[PDB]
Design a protein around this ligand. Structure first.
Ligand SMILES: Nc1ncnc2c1ncn2[C@@H]1O[C@H](COP(=O)(O)OP(=O)(O)OP(=O)(O)OP(=O)(O)OP(=O)(O)O)[C@@H](O)[C@H]1O
Ligand SMILES: Nc1ncnc2[nH]cnc12
Ligand SMILES: [Ca+2]
Length: 142
């Protein structure tokens, strides 16, 4: 298979982006494939040939959200509390372009959100680890 695991905890290694607008007032969220009313952020499994997390992160942001930007920060890691099953590596991305067409554009909705709506969405989705990643970002909370 094409899936990499932590040799310590055996958690699944995943990378994603907090995609922020230049003014940093909004963050890009996508609907989940499993729970279609739930809003999350682009992320996905690292595969064996990928040389770094940034690669996985930018791949998944393209694939899942049709977003292209530059990585402006490493937001560190966050684990899963449901040992852990998933170790996430997050980066902040400045959005340079949102393309109307992208691999998953038929199986996923996508929208910008202020800090406040995004926080509620992630509590509604029950993803505190993703909210922690969002809180480490330079998003404006006002
Ligand atoms: N708190 C949590 N921590 C870790 N994993 C959690 C989770 N809650 C659900 N999942 C589990 O992660 C997978 C993706 O669900 P998701 O986060 O809603 O993502 P998604 O369904 O939008 O994306 P998928 O197409 O399922 O892809 P994955 O994120 O599994 O990874 P992949 O892109 O490399 O296939 C599912 O099997 C789900 O049960
Ligand atoms: N990058 C980070 N990782 C873990 N805890 C943090 N608290 C603030 N920034 C953090
Ligand atoms: Ca995914």
């Amino acid at each position: 298979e094409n899936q990499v695991y932590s040799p310590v905890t055996g958690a699944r290694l995943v990378a994603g982006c907090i995609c922020l607008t230049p003014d940093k007032k909004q963050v890009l969220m996508i609907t989940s494939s499993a729970h279609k009313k739930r809003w999350i952020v682009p992320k996905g499994g690292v595969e064996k040939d990928e040389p770094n997390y940034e690669t996985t992160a930018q791949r998944e942001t393209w694939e899942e959200a049709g977003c292209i930007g530059k990585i402006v920060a490493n937001l560190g890691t966050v684990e899963d509390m449901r040992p852990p099953r998933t170790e996430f590596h997050f980066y902040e991305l400045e959005i340079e372009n949102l393309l109307d067409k992208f691999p998953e554009c038929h199986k996923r909705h996508r929208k910008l959100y202020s800090y406040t709506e995004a926080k509620q969405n992630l509590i509604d989705a029950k993803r505190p680890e993703l909210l922690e990643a969002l809180n480490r970002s330079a998003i404006i909370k006002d």
